[PDB]
Amino acid sequence: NLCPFGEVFNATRFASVYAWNRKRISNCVADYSVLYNSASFSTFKCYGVSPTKLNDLCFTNVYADSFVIRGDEVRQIAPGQTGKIADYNYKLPDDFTGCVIAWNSNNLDSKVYNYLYRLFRKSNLKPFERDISTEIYQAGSTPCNGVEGFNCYFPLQSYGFQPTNGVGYQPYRVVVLSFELLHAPATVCGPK
C-alpha cells in the first residue's frame, strides 16, 4: 500500500510549466528514504519540513507538482520569488511548507522543442494557480479577434532545450512536494 511517488518522479514525460501536473497523494504509506538518499538530484530545498524525518509523521494530504523549466529558473521555485516562471507559470506561497526537488534532464528532454511557458500575462498568478489559457494576448487597445499580429502576442513561448546549450539553459525536471497536517485524520503516514 505504498504511495505512488514513482509515477511522478520517474514519469516518462513531464508537463510544461504553464500546465504543471499535480498528483494528489492520500490513504497510503510512503518510504521517503528513496527520495532523500538519492544522488541524482542537483537541488533539494525544503521549507518548514525535514525530509530526513519524513518517515515518522502522518500528513492529511500531500501534493506533488511536476513540470520542466530551465536551470536559470530553478531559483524562482521558492517562496517570495519573482520572475516569469514565478509570476506567470508557477507560484509558491510565502508560507510554503514543503520541498522543491530538481535535477538535470538534458538527456531526456533535449533534442537535436515542445515544453512551453507563459510569456505574457496581465497580473501575477496567485499561489498554486494553474493557467492553461491560449487566448491571444492583447498588448494594445484594439481587440485581437484571436489572430496574431501587431499588439497581439501568443501568450506561450517554447523553450530551446538543445543538447549543446549551457547548463543553465538545459531542461530540469522539477517535483514540488506540498505537506499539510491541519486538524483532520492524517491518512498519509510513513513506514512507521
Epitope: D72, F120, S123, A139, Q157, G166
Partner: antibody, heavy 117, light 108 residues
Framework: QVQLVESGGGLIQPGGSLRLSCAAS????????MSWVRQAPGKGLEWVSV???????FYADSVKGRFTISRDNSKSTLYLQMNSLRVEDTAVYYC???????????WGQGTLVTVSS | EIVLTQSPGTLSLSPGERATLSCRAS??????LAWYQQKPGQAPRLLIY???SRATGIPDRFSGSGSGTDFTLTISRLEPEDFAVYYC?????????FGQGTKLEIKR
Amino acid sequence: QVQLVESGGGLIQPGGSLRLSCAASGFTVSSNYMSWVRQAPGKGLEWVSVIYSGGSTFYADSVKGRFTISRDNSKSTLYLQMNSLRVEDTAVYYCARDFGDFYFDYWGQGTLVTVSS
Amino acid sequence: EIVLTQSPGTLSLSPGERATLSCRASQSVSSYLAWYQQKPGQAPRLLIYGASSRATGIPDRFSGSGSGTDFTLTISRLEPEDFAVYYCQQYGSSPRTFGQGTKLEIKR
C-alpha cells in the same frame, strides 16, 4: 503607430535626485514589458531596469538600490526615479518597449542626464 | 556577466557592396540575439530578432545568421543611408548585455 517621447534629463549635482518620464502611445503600458537603456558618451548600450506586465521590477547591479522604475497607467507614462546620482551615471537614457524581457522593438528619442558639480 | 565581442571595431565599404559584421559571445546563448542600427543623433532601431528573423519594415537586404556563440549580420546592396553603428544584444541569460558596436562608413 508607436510613439515614445522622453523628458526630465538635465544637469544634477552628484548625490541628487532626478526623475525621467516616457510617454507612450500605440500600446498599453501596463500590458507590456518596459525597460530603460542608457548610453554613456562615446560608450555602448547598457541595460538599466525593466518592469514586467504583471508589475515585477528588476534592476542592474550598478543601479540597484538607487534607481526605481515605475509606470503611470492614467498618464500612459513610464518613470525612472534616479536617486543618489553619481558622475558615472552621466549618460543618454533611452526609453525602450521590451518584448517579453528579450529585445527592444521600439525606442524613444532619448534624454541626456548630466551629473556634475 | 556575459561579454559580447563585436568584430570588426569599424569597417568602411563602398555603396552596392556586402557588409559582414561578426558578434561573438563568452557563453552559449542559442540564437537569443538581436541586432540594432543606430544612426547618428538618433535612437537604436531594431533590425533582426532571434538572430535570423527580420523586424517589421526592415528591407530584405538585411539578414541575420549564426547560432550558439558565433553570429553574423549580413547587409547587401548598401544604400547611402545604411551606414551607422550596429550592436548585438543577447537575451538568453540575465542581465542582458550589448556589444561595443561596429562603426560603418561609406567609401567614396
